[PDB]
Symmetry: C3
Subunit: 147 residues, 3 copies
């Protein structure tokens, strides 16, 4: 059961609040606490100072995430991962996850260590400023340029 706000201009429901507390904008069947449907620019968050959007969790073992889906199937995500915060800025590292065609996790393409800033490619625990598990290709030669 749901509550809806409509306009006699189109008779179409514009906002819906169901009995479990979910709010739909453009849907009468929201599947999230806030569920918005649109065309192109769905949501716009404007800050008149430095800032913007915050994704937060209620506990250190709950991991905030931004998830990209197509037809509501996981494709990519950027998230703070589950590495334990044991002190000294350990844990809660940044990860870009890739998902298969059915939405199952394939792996972490990128993991940035919070304590060191080390950038890992296919490496969940990078041990150098850049750390690659696998192959490396450069179009202009075989060497780094000494910067």
């Amino acid at each position: 059961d749901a509550f809806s706000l409509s306009f006699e201009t189109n008779n179409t429901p514009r906002m819906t609040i169901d009995d479990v507390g979910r709010v739909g904008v453009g849907t009468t069947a929201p599947t999230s606490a806030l569920h918005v449907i649109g065309t192109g620019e769905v949501a716009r968050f404007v800050t008149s100072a430095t800032g913007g959007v915050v994704i937060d969790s209620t506990a250190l073992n709950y991991n905030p995430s931004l998830i990209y889906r197509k037809t509501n199937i996981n494709r990519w995500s950027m998230m703070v991962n589950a590495a334990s915060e044991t002190g000294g800025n350990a844990g809660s590292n940044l990860s870009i996850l890739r998902y298969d065609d059915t939405g199952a996790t394939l792996g972490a393409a990128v993991t940035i260590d919070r304590a060191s800033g080390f950038f890992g490619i296919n490496t969940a625990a990078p041990a150098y400023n850049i750390h690659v598990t696998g192959t490396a290709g450069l179009s202009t030669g075989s060497a780094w340029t000494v910067a």
Copy 2:
């Protein structure tokens, strides 16, 4: 033609007849349009999860777009590469935009099927694939990990 909820005789939320909802604006330009100072929107999860950007079809591409004065500057999006099977297609791209908001191309492309990370490379064929130069402050070779 729209409805506004007011507190302190000021409109706080507005719903128009086209279905757009504004928080802090009486003239929303998107389905949800929020204005604030600093932390504009906060999404708090009591489990692992958060915010989902979704599309209604495989050929519609979900994106997070960063603008300044409503001009495109950067974006992180799932691109239009066709999903031909075996996890092909729908790769991740970080796009840069010029001062007028026109695309300058993908600075980074990550392949979904392999995880390969391409810098200035649309079709990475190595775990890291760079088109151009590579600078390292400490020497010219990799350390064998």
Copy 3:
């Protein structure tokens, strides 16, 4: 003062006296403040598009911020480098934060004018530019691609 829309017997949406909107909380701390379990917010586009983070001036930085227990952990933002022409300025940065939420600096900086990808490097001068060490599991050299 605040108004809440109540269903069953529970407040679901709240508008307080300063104009902040809470969904799942009667004490919103930002313009829009949403509480949920797992799937907190879902933004669905029936075309190519999605979510826009925008600022009202070039010196204001739009940001996506990841927190745990409301303490900064990571952020991805467009920085305040001056837009002096030729697509200079407004570069992309990924910032890391310590356990108390204080900034530890930019782990990654992508230059908008060139696309150059800097790791621990504020001004990348190569297509990839690393300040520090480099580790590769398969050898000490790049493969010529």
